[PDB]
């Protein structure tokens with residue numbers, strides 16, 4: 001009934017009134033590339049850094065099965081596909097979404113969406129949680145709160161899937177193109193604190209050709225942060 | 236993100252841009268009760284009389300997985316649940332559909348929908364094909380042709396799933412109720428011909444408690460037509 005016109009992402013869509021986690025279902029089940037798993041609510045939503053993700057009714061909670069298997073080097077860029085897709089959709093609704101390296105989208109420094117990519121071999125699961133009309137925790141915001149009015153959840157879904165399909169098809173061809181899009185939509189030029197094995201502060205200058213965050217410490221030392229067990233905090 | 240509020244039918248929905256047959260997929264895949272399989276188009280759609288069923292873009296092509304298992308002979312009643320559900324949905328859109336025993340819905344004697352039930356395995360698959368905005372064969376009709384305007388396919392889907400869930404939940408408790416609903420919406424009191432071996436003609440009087448079509452031949456003989464391979468023609 002949906003009439004999706006995408007090439008890969010959205011070939012099939014599995015909808016649930018309720019699910020434990022779309023990412024877990026997608027990782028576990030035998031699914032074709034491009035299949036989207038979406039649920040009205042998640043009872044056990046998962047975030048990055050082993051944090052839980054509140055997923056009440058009203059938000060967009062989905063996961064997409066991908067099997068890019070490009071050069072091992074240009075693979076860790078899948079997270080950016082999700083973040084950029086969300087930013088483009090937000091702009092379509094006139095909301096100023098900006099990317100917080102490596103996987104968050106903020107509006108006025110408040111979290112409106114998060115991306116969780118999980119991969120085991122050939123299969124890559126791209127999870128995206130976007131606050132639309134749902135209530136949110138402190139430190140977060142939603143499309144409804146930003147616009148001051150309810151937004152048709154299905155319209156957001158259609159827009160996002162369309163953007164993601166386009167970004168993904170181009171990523172298979174030109175893997176580095178996404179980096180330019182991230183750079184143009186990422187919060188940079190401000191001081192940040194990097195939390196990992198210890199911590200350090202500096203100016204988030206840009207992302208390099210591998211998607212690493214480039215930080216300039218006050219001493220002038222340049223650090224390159226790799227996506228992984230590391231978090232970013234704005235000062 | 237569809238936000239369905241049904242109890243059983245529609246707890247999960249699997250959408251396909253293209254599929255061979257929603258009934259075939261439902262039969263050969265492990266799916267929980269209430270799962271709805273829907274596709275924009277079918278490349279190998281089929282009907283009751285082991286015939287082909289045109290399933291172009293624009294129509295509503297779906298299958299529902301059921302596992303009622305009421306006393307075992309309220310089986311032909313499942314087909315009736317599908318037919319009545321369609322009739323109720325059509326009424327919501329200002330269209331008067333009537334049932335042609337045992338699985339077709341006609342509008343002014345032109346076919347607008349067909350129901351195909353298959354109990355293969357121990358699961359029962361309820362398939363429904365409804366002409367909405369798609370081109371239709373000569374002699375048939377569609378919601379678009381009846382209303383003179385395009386009808387939002389998802390609105391039809393939501394309406395039908397809602398009606399079917401209600402009808403099914405009641406069927407599980409009061410299996411006999413569907414019979415009077417069928418009788419009140421079925422084409423009766425007209426002459427028909429039963430094709431095939433031992434063909435005969437008569438007046439279609441009503442359906443009995445087993446869902447059999449009761450025919451009064453001109454001789455006064457009363458025959459009971461069982462639901463299955465049977466082919467009926469209006470005279």
Ligand SMILES: O=C(O)CCCC[C@@H]1SC[C@@H]2NC(=O)N[C@@H]21
Pocket residue numbers: 020021022023024042044045046047048049051053055060061062063103104113114115116127128129130
């Ligand atoms: O910002 C983060 O830390 C990532 C959050 C990712 C949330 C989404 S909701 C859809 C998918 N299913 C999950 O359990 N998590 C992701």
Ligand SMILES: O=C(O)CCCC[C@@H]1SC[C@@H]2NC(=O)N[C@@H]21
Pocket residue numbers: 255256257258259277279280281282283284288290295296297298338339348349350351362363364365
């Ligand atoms: O009128 C008939 O003889 C029954 C037609 C049933 C058509 C539907 S379309 C959804 C489902 N998938 C199929 O292949 N057939 C049924």
